[PDB]
């Protein structure tokens, strides 16, 4: 409703870096808010794409940002009569970023890995890897839970069980309030997808440079499966956390699996031990239900609600014709021990091929009426197809079915405006939570500042 579309702030990165592919707010030990920005194709040392991360101080005029530097060098370790290798070319550093406390977590889902032993090898595969930084102290750590030292022959003999070689750890990511990092790994267990969790504190204290294979014992991975419903389901494509079981001591996980069950799609809610609490099935095959998931209480009853985006949902139209426009589903959490039901609300896109629901961002309470609100992106939507972000206000009954405000992409065609979104933080300290929108295709980020209701 009250985001200002007249005076925006633009941050920019190098051409072709895909600056804006992922972003998040970051507070330093003093509570000063900055913006961390991923740029998955930033040029590395050998003039080869490795991705990169930028830490933008807040300034109304915006501009350029300093790098958050990480080691971009391939590594080799000859140990235990084996040769360990990390490959960082085209690893996509910054394909995801998240901030928790004074710590930043940036992931390279396509970092490759291999182990050699005589004439055998594990195979060079994209295990993915995450880099952790404490900007104010210069501390650095890594987390790469899918790295292994088993040779090919073994996987083949065991029928490819517990095969974490194509994890792509960090494809998505989130951190619990308590500081547990939860990585999505859509390629885990031969493309079923798995989740890797470990306390940030333990990642730092157990990491040393040059080891490559080390134990983080407090870590916890999800499980393999023989159930075909899960094959190629990309469980972990998206991830989020929230409270869904009534017990404030336990934290629950929300995992997107957009191709679950032969591309029907699904999203699941789990306890911290990866036991399934609820499962929500997609509505239409190939709609990519679970592409994005968002958690926030929208009807002010203190119970977290779930939103799921299916950006390729095809809406039914006159004369038995379907039109791809994308859709978002709202599930309100019921009182006491009960299972989520049919969605309470369906939001459907309008622009053909617009991909409404590609990203969903909690805004907190934008107009300060006591109900939390959301922003939904349609990266190729709008009458011009340049991209749109639509705001929906919370209400006692859920969400308003019509957008209170629409933000049209200020960038040129192909910018993918809205592909990444983040709200619920007051960056300029005027008492109203603000919105940042990535346009990786244009290598830029836009900041919308919330203002008093007109």
């Amino acid at each position: 409703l009250n985001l200002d579309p007249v005076q925006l702030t633009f941050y920019a990165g190098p051409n072709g870096s895909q600056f804006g592919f992922s972003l998040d707010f970051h507070k330093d030990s003093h509570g000063r808010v900055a913006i961390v920005v991923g740029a998955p194709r930033t040029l590395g040392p050998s003039q080869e794409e490795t991705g990169g991360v930028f830490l933008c101080p807040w300034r109304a005029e915006g501009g350029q940002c300093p790098s958050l530097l990480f080691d971009l060098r391939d590594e080799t370790r000859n140990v235990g009569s084996q040769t360990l290798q990390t490959f960082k070319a085209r690893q996509g550093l910054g394909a995801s970023v998240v901030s928790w406390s004074d710590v930043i977590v940036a992931c390279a889902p396509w970092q490759h890995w291999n182990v050699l032993e005589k004439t055998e090898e594990a195979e060079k595969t994209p295990v993915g890897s995450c880099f952790l930084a404490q900007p104010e102290s210069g501390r650095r750590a890594e987390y790469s839970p899918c790295r292994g030292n088993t040779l090919s022959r073994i996987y083949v003999e065991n029928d490819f069980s517990w095969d974490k070689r194509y994890c792509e750890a960090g494809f998505s990511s989130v951190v619990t309030q308590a500081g547990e990092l939860v990585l999505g790994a859509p390629g885990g267990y031969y493309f079923l997808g798995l989740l890797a969790q470990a306390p940030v504190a333990d990642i730092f204290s157990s990491y040393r440079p040059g080891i490559l294979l080390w134990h983080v014992s407090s870590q916890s991975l999800s499980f393999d499966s023989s159930n075909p419903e899960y094959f190629d389901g990309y469980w972990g494509y998206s991830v989020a956390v929230g409270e869904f079981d009534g017990d404030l001591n336990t934290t629950e996980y929300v995992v997107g699996a957009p191709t679950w069950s032969w591309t029907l799609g699904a999203v699941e809610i789990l306890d911290s031990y990866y036991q399934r609490l609820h499962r929500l099935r997609g509505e239409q095959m190939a709609s990519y239900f679970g592409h994005s998931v968002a958690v926030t209480d929208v009807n002010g009853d203190g119970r977290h609600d779930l939103l799921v985006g299916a950006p390729l949902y095809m809406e039914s139209r006159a004369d038995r014709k379907l039109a791809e426009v994308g859709r978002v589903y709202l599930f309100l959490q019921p009182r006491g021990p009960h299972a989520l039901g049919a969605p309470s609300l369906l939001l459907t896109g309008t622009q053909l091929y617009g991909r409404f629901g590609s990203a969903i961002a909690p805004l907190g309470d934008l107009d300060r009426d006591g109900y939390n609100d959301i922003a939904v992106a349609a990266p190729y939507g709008g009458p011009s197809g340049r991209g749109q972000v639509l705001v929906f206000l919370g209400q006692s009954e859920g969400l308003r079915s019509r957008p209170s405000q629409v933000l049209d992409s200020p960038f040129p065609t192909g910018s993918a405006f809205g592909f990444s979104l983040r709200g619920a933080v007051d960056i300029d300290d005027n008492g109203y939570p603000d919105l940042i929108v990535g346009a990786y295709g244009a290598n830029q980020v836009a900041v919308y500042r919330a203002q008093p209701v007109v």
Partner: antibody
Amino acid sequence: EVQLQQSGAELVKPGASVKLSCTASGFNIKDTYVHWVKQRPEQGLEWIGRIDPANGYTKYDPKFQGKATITADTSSNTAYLQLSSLTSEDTAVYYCVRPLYDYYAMDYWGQGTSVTVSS
Amino acid sequence: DILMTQSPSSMSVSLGDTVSITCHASQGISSNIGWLQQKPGKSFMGLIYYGTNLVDGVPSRFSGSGSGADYSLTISSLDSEDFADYYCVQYAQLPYTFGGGTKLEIKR
């Protein structure tokens, strides 16, 4: 806390066999590699071999091939070392070892189990 | 098998001393070394892994250094408990192999 409780001292006759045990305490035996090391006063420290309790795959020093047999039962969080055709030279102290962080390291040690072969 | 030559076999030093134990390998092991301690009539305790990294709980007066095939353990300001047996171990290759060991003894 990580503790490796090894079985009690063994006193066996030559030509016999014995099976030492090493039980993980405060953690899951399946977490890391588990190694066995032999110590003698004069000869010093010798690496016997390791097992990966997660899957049962073992490695040995060819010197101990046919003599030592390393196994593990995740169910009881315990690892074992079986010695056969015991002789007077097999008389020594035996340790189970695991790494702290580094996959290949030797950081944590059991208290040790003495083995005496005599008629 | 990689040969680990640990010198000296023993040294008679005093408290507060700063001593150094060297370890020589038959070939390059690129920091894939560990240092161990065995207090008299007791089990082993880990000191260092990967050449220079302190095991959790070990005092910082212990330090590790070296590269290629030559590495050193160095204790600054010896304590009364520091009088014991010290061994090195290489895990660059299987089989893992150990050093002859070194025994710190009180000087009088």
